[PDB]
Design a protein around this motif. Structure first.
Motif, mmCIF file in Angstrom:
data_model
loop_
_atom_site.group_PDB
_atom_site.id
_atom_site.type_symbol
_atom_site.label_atom_id
_atom_site.label_comp_id
_atom_site.label_asym_id
_atom_site.label_seq_id
_atom_site.Cartn_x
_atom_site.Cartn_y
_atom_site.Cartn_z
ATOM 1 N N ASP A 168 0.880 -1.032 -0.124
ATOM 2 C CA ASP A 168 -0.139 0.444 0.179
ATOM 3 C C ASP A 168 0.545 1.126 -0.169
ATOM 4 O O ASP A 168 0.553 2.434 -1.084
ATOM 5 N N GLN A 228 2.760 1.703 -3.786
ATOM 6 C CA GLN A 228 1.736 2.097 -4.801
ATOM 7 C C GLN A 228 1.704 4.093 -4.608
ATOM 8 O O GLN A 228 1.391 4.373 -4.941
ATOM 9 N N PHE A 285 4.895 -6.523 -4.445
ATOM 10 C CA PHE A 285 5.017 -5.302 -5.425
ATOM 11 C C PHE A 285 5.426 -5.448 -6.207
ATOM 12 O O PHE A 285 6.796 -5.575 -6.316
ATOM 13 N N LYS A 342 4.197 5.300 -5.749
ATOM 14 C CA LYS A 342 5.198 5.468 -7.202
ATOM 15 C C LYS A 342 3.972 6.371 -7.637
ATOM 16 O O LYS A 342 4.535 7.074 -8.277
ATOM 17 N N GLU A 343 2.743 6.682 -6.880
ATOM 18 C CA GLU A 343 2.387 7.466 -7.101
ATOM 19 C C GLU A 343 2.607 8.875 -6.969
ATOM 20 O O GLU A 343 2.144 10.252 -7.869
#
Ligand SMILES: OC[C@H]1O[C@@H](O)[C@H](O)[C@@H](O)[C@@H]1O
Length: 313
Positions: free
Chosen positions: A220, A223, A305, A226-227
């Protein structure tokens, strides 16, 4: 064979990563393993399981004490019964435990604060989210962070404790941004905090406006990194904590405590000899994420991931 018990602090996926190391070491060394976490921070649950392990006559115990002081008597009792004890993830250094296996929490927090300082240009308002006001790892991370930002103009405007409850981590962070519309940054101390803060920041449309520096590298969090919602996270090695805790206790059975300790890193602070396995920290950012995933895969550490490579023999 022998049996080795491991007690962690909450149900978070972080503790599942620890448990996978415990399991892997159990298979590699041929030792039965037992693992427990309470749902959220719960010292009495930890204490009760500790007593159960002792009554079952396990051959070793690794515990991540939510309160370093509260566990001292029960660790003493285990040692009196001839059950070696080590800590992992967070310490109880006055307990008689033989070894601490985990992150240098003070230095990790200090590094997080240096990162925050650079991110904000030495100025602005930070809110801290954590899951304990008693566990040493939290206390150390927060102190390191404070020491690192001390010289700047940065101010901590709230420190919020969710007691390792993710719903509460979310509601507290939400409330904080509402209470502090001019917030410049969140600092997340435990695995629940980064992603809770990220969710709140993204929901509020403040991605990049309110910076997040946090801990851990669960999927989580990765992610959100990454964003670009999270600019940096201090990754630990939970799998290695579990694996090496079992390994140390196994050795203490097979070759004895003294012989095992002579193999480990010895430290001496304020004249006190102690033994510490620093499982390491990885600063993970949007810019070095792929390299991080590469590093972990080549270190043999499972990360659920990103892409994975399989070598056919
Ligand atoms: O909150 C989940 C976990 O977060 C990690 O960052 C800490 O090292 C643990 O002690 C804690 O239980």
């Amino acid at each position: 064979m022998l049996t080795i018990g491991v007690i962690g602090k909450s149900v978070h996926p972080y503790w599942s990563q620890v448990e996978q190391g415990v399991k892997a070491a159990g298979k590699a060394l041929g030792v039965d393993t037992k693992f427990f976490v309470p749902q959220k921070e719960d010292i009495n649950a930890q204490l009760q399981m500790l007593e159960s392990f002792i009554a079952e006559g396990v051959n070793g115990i690794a515990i991540a004490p939510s309160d370093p002081t509260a566990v001292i008597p029960t660790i003493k009792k285990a040692l009196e019964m001839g059950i070696p004890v080590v800590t992992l993830d967070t310490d109880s250094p006055d307990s008689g435990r033989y070894v601490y296996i985990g992150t240098d929490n003070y230095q990790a927090g200090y590094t997080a604060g240096l990162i925050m300082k650079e991110l904000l240009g030495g100025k602005g308002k930070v809110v801290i989210g954590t899951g304990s006001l008693t566990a040493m790892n939290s206390l150390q991370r927060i102190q390191g962070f404070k020491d690192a930002i001390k010289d700047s103009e940065i101010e901590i405007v709230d420190i919020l404790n969710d007691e390792e409850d993710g719903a509460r981590a979310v509601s507290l962070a939400e409330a904080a941004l509402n209470a502090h519309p001019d917030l410049d940054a969140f600092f997340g101390v435990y695995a629940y905090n980064g992603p809770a803060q990220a969710l709140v920041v993204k929901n509020a449309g403040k991605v990049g406006k309110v910076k997040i520096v946090c801990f851990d590298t669960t999927p989580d969090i990765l992610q959100y990194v990454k964003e670009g919602v999270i600019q940096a996270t201090m990754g630990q090695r939970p799998y290695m904590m579990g694996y090496l805790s079992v390994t140390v206790l196994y050795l203490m059975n097979k070759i004895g405590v003294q012989n095992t300790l002579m193999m480990l890193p010895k430290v001496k602070v304020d004249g006190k000899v102690d033994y510490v396995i620093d499982t390491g920290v990885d600063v993970v950012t949007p810019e070095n994420l792929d390299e991080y995933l590469k590093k972990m895969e080549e270190l043999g550490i499972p990360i659920k991931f990103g892409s994975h490579h399989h070598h056919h023999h």
